[PDB]
Design a protein around this ligand. Sequence first.
Ligand SMILES: *[C@@H]1O[C@H](CO)[C@@H](O)[C@H](O)[C@H]1NC(C)=O
Ligand SMILES: *[C@@H]1O[C@H](CO)[C@@H](O)[C@H](O)[C@H]1NC(C)=O
Ligand SMILES: [Cu+2]
Ligand SMILES: [Cu+2]
Ligand SMILES: [Cu+2]
Ligand SMILES: [Mg+2]
Ligand SMILES: [Mg+2]
Ligand SMILES: [Mg+2]
Lengths: 325, 325, 325
Amino acid sequence: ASSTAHKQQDINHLLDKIYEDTKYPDLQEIAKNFNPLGDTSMYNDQGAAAEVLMKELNDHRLLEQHHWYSLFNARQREEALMLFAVLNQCKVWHCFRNNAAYFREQMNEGEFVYALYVGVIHSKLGDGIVLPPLYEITPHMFTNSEVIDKAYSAKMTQKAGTFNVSFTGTKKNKEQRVAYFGEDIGMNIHHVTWHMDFPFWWQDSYGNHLDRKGELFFWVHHQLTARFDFERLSNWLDPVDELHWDRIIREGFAPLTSYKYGGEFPVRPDNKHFEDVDGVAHVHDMEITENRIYEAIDHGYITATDGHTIDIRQPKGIELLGDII
Amino acid sequence: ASSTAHKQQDINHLLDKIYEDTKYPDLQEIAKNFNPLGDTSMYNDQGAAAEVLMKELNDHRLLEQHHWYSLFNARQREEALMLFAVLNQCKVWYCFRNNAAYFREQMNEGEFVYALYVGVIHSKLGDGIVLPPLYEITPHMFTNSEVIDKAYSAKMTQKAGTFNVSFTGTKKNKEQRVAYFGEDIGMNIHHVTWHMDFPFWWQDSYGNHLDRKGELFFWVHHQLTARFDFERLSNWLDPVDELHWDRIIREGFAPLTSYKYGGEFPVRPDNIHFEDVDGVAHVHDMEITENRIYEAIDHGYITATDGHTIDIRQPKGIELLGDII
Amino acid sequence: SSTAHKQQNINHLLDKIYEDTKYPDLQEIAKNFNPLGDTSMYNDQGAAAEVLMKELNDHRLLEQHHWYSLFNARQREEALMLFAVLNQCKVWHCFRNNAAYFREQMNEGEFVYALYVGVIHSKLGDGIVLPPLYEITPHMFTNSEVIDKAYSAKMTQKAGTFNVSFTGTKKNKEQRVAYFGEDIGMNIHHVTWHMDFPFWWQDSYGNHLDRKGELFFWVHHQLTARFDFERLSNWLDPVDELHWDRIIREGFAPLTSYKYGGEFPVRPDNIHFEDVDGVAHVHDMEITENRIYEAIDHGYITATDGHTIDIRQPKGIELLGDIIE
Ligand SMILES: *[C@@H]1O[C@H](CO)[C@@H](O)[C@H](O)[C@H]1NC(C)=O
Ligand SMILES: *[C@@H]1O[C@H](CO)[C@@H](O)[C@H](O)[C@H]1NC(C)=O
Ligand SMILES: [Cu+2]
Ligand SMILES: [Cu+2]
Ligand SMILES: [Cu+2]
Ligand SMILES: [Mg+2]
Ligand SMILES: [Mg+2]
Ligand SMILES: [Mg+2]
């Protein structure tokens, strides 16, 4: 029941054809009849997390299915983490499986996929499971619009096919020379999995501490940056400049990619100045935040909420900077 | 003589025809013969405020009559407050009336009117007095130049008349749609009187504490702003933008109003950037000040002159912020 | 070891500084003297001589016949290594012999600098009068036109005296006051003040420089006020202040050259500051400025561990000069 074979098959089934109601009769039956609140002894918190999520569901406060999802959207992230919190409290696999099946059919698919992945990664119940590659679970997030269009045409015409992916832009765009780095599907899996392993929303009340996370955050991104610059050097290009909030972003981008639901990803023109983003931040807020971080660095200490100093002139200083940055 | 009738009559006479020497023979006699330094027992401060003001007067250091006055001008405010301080120390009405009559004939009329108003408001001797509306005491400050010119013409020709005021700007100026809000003479009296009741120069050594003043400062201006935006919404306009020191002030203004002495009020063009103001501040100084206030808010404490923390994560915090802002 | 002999030694060492020494005694010393041969001549028993000799032997010192700038961190460090040796000499023969030895090994600009500050800050230098730098390194005080006539006079082996005119043209109103900043004595005053009160001074060199940070404020205040008096004398307005976010109105063409390194660069009129690679971003200057003003307006300087150093006291101005220079 909780053998590796059954848990793996359950996860495979839950992630199969994620944009449609489940086609597996056993999962259909669970989603119809299981009650996340029916027996709260299955949870290490006696049902607190399930109560939170069920109240949001019953009050019609959750993001609808067939809608874009972004982990950087505060409310959508909070909704995905409500499901993660339920899965994380499950004592045994049948709780994990049944809640996953129940909420798969109620919740936005992007939120669901995210919660199930981090639930598997951060629960002991997920030990031994191999998560399918996200580029086959949500291929729109890893595949350009031209190839997706060819897939839609194959499906409309009921014909199989294999379609070649090319890079975006043209040869006139020198940045295309290094598209094989940031568009590589495995490099993108590396990146999302690092953040799934070391999420910025992690709280140790979820079960365990993530050792040196803030320093690993610095290091993994330093390595992405240094590796990209090595590809630029390999292709007769100069190193990337750094962004600054008061200077133009020289290199624009046309993704030529689309969401499954939500439309095409937006383009950014060349040589644009940063503008304030309504509901996110003013450009000036970013500059102030940057200044405050540099104040801590140049002071040698981070300032606590009550004004006391937290020394960063020690080996953990870089980690604490990762935490606040 | 201390009856409400006589005190009101005295105030009416002191404020009558304020740009000319007093036409009331009894006030003339007082102004000629009263000695503010002649009986220290008149005052709760043993005569100190009277000595301070008389020294400035005798040293010819006071602003001349028939000259513009601005409460925001440090030296002119200091002079007005020297007269306030005398009135505020008078024990009995005859001291208050006689000092007011004496200094009416010695001091700038704008300073005098200001000091007499705040003196009445903040002295128990002022209880029961109704201050005349400032739009009839200094009508230039509430009446556009065209109507003042018609009044001057009526006086030149010795012919009574009533003249219609009809809002600044043209119909091509969408901001004129809501001119009835900020140009309403009563709204302007509301605003000046709030600041007279709750002056930024108040010190409790003047006799009493002004409860929650800094928070009331936030609230009265929040309500002015919210009420203006309701007029904009009523007139098919969007809400006002906020000012930014580094961004253009979109909407200029032509007051089409004049001082009695000092000339026409200055116009501001549309779409101008802030410039440094000689003798006042650099634009960058405003940005630094803003940054320091936001530092206190985001720290949760104000920093005292010796560096210690003043907690604002409490109900009085908004009041302390009003004090420093 | 008397003043006459010490003065002559210095005269000889500074003679024809761009060429190997022509004095047989100094050539013999440069050939045979070992700075490490008798450490009993140093107060540090040879520590400074060991540091400099290692740099020399590892071929890490700036070559001869190359421009030198005291503001270049590594070149300054090299000059100060020689200063450190001279400063450790107990007796004059150590000072003279090390000077002669390193004159032939080190860059001439570094050597002249080290020899001057060595004479000034060693008791062995008492009674010596340093030759004017405008005759030791005339390129740094003489426009390129006159140097060329000197070069021509030497190429043709004919004596001459050549008139120096001020830089610019009569169309350049700033030329009206060129006699101030271009005066060779005013230039010597300025270099010598900084030689007497160097920003690199550490009291481990042997003594404290009393009130240095306040004298730094004062000497430059007086240069600024004196320049403005010349502007007033020539129908010019006072100088504006620089700001990092505003154009530098007045450009400058020095029309002067290094002996080695080429012509001094020109600055066009009306330029915005640009970031300087290897030095600082313009934004870094603004942040540094802000931090200094934070200390001034707080009334205290913040120490490395966060504790406050009160500057509301007579030494505050000195501490400000310490942190501003
Ligand atoms: C002024 O207003 C009154 C009433 O609104 C009107 O009777 C009168 O004609 C007006 N005068 C002019 C000059 O418009
Ligand atoms: C140089 O100046 C001197 C005096 O200042 C003058 O006698 C001489 O004519 C000048 N020489 C030239 C070439 O102008
Ligand atoms: Cu990342
Ligand atoms: Cu107000
Ligand atoms: Cu200097
Ligand atoms: Mg008068
Ligand atoms: Mg200011
Ligand atoms: Mg070079």
